[PDB]
Structure 1
Amino acid sequence: PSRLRKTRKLRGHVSHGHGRIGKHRKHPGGRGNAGGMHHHRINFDKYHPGYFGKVGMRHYHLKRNQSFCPTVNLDKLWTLVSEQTRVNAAKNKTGAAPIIDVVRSGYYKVLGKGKLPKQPVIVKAKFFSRRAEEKIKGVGGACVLVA
């Protein structure tokens, strides 16, 4: 709404909120973020370090599909599969362990962030990290691969 803005209370003020010594001229510091190397040097070095120059290899035809490998954690590894499997694998005295197929839930790589409850699993992923594998082994349960 223009009814609530500032210019409804800057009528009658002879400069309209932009000073009388330094008037509101059109473009005093160049257009846009011009003057990176020259006269806005200390804005671009106090507030955007790293901005000028090249670093790293050039990759001509990047494909996010090739680089696609989204991650899940051992915290939320049980979130994927419903509560009935947890309570049945807790009540289950036969040692049978549920299968957690993370790939159909949509995560390719299991990383291990936090505490996994002492309850056996077969975690079925596409990749693993070393600590995730060691935590699933330490709970007692296996890590199988699918491609």
Structure 2
Amino acid sequence: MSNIKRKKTRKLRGHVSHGHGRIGKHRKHPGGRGNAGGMHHHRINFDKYHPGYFGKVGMRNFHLRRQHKFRPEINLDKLWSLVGAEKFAELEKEKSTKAPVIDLVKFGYYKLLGRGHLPARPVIVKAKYFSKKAEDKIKKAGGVCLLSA
């Protein structure tokens, strides 16, 4: 499926050594096998390029459950793309007929973070968890966050 016509086995026919030198030509494992020895003769290669290899920074969680730190998040940055496409500007008549009741647990999201630059319209967001700046820019525009599961 791969070429070989473009591979270099086909260009080294027939030059003697096949890419590898007269002198210290291709032998089986001349530094060892795999990640060994990372503290001895491959020391420099493991720091640089991999610092933080060899040690132990700690707290052993026997049986992590990744269904505990789940929390899908969403910035204020988007947040208006969730409500449909033409209500974007159909409310900026100007006519404040609408704070959109958004429920993020029906959109798969659990926290509302706040990176934002949000517009001046009210919303009614219903996330599980809060960012503090999220609830400080939605209150600044006449909105809520209904603290709901």
Instruction: Return the TM-score normalized by structure 1.
Output: 0.94
Counterpart residue type for residue 10 of structure 1: L
Once the two structures are TM-superposed, the CA of residue 92 in structure 1 deviates from its matched residue by: 6.5
Once the two structures are TM-superposed, the CA of residue 137 in structure 1 deviates from its matched residue by: 1.0
**Cα distance between partner residues in 1 of 2:67 and 2:50:** 31
The CA RMSD over aligned residues, in Å, is 1.4
Tell me which residue corresponds to 2:78. 76
**Cα distance between partner residues in 2 of 1:111 and 1:96:** 22
Tell me which residue corresponds to 1:118. 120
Tell me which residue corresponds to 1:17. 19
CA contact (8 A) 2:111 2:127 kept: yes
CA shift digits 1:46-75 (9 cap, x unpaired):
110001111020001111111110111101
User: Which deviates further from its counterpart, 94-103 or 27-36?
Assistant: 94-103
**Cα distance between partner residues in 1 of 2:125 and 2:91:** 14
Counterpart residue type for residue 113 of structure 2: L
Once the two structures are TM-superposed, the CA of residue 95 in structure 1 deviates from its matched residue by: 4.3
CA contact (8 A) 2:83 2:100 kept: no
**Count of residue correspondences:** 147
Structure 2: tracts of 5 or more residues without a match: none
Counterpart residue type for residue 106 of structure 2: R
Question: Which of 129, 132, 135 pairs up with 2:131?
Answer: 129
Q: Between Structure 1 and Structure 2, which shows a larger proportion of strand residues?
A: 1
CA shift digits 1:69-124 (9 cap, x unpaired):
01111011112221233234333725431111111111100000120011110011
Q: Percent identity?
A: 69
- Which runs of 4 or more aligned residues in structure 1 lie more than 6 Å from their structure 2 counterparts after TM superposition? none
Instruction: Return the TM-score normalized by structure 2.
Output: 0.92
Counterpart residue type for residue 133 of structure 2: R
**Cα distance between partner residues in 1 of 2:98 and 2:17:** 80
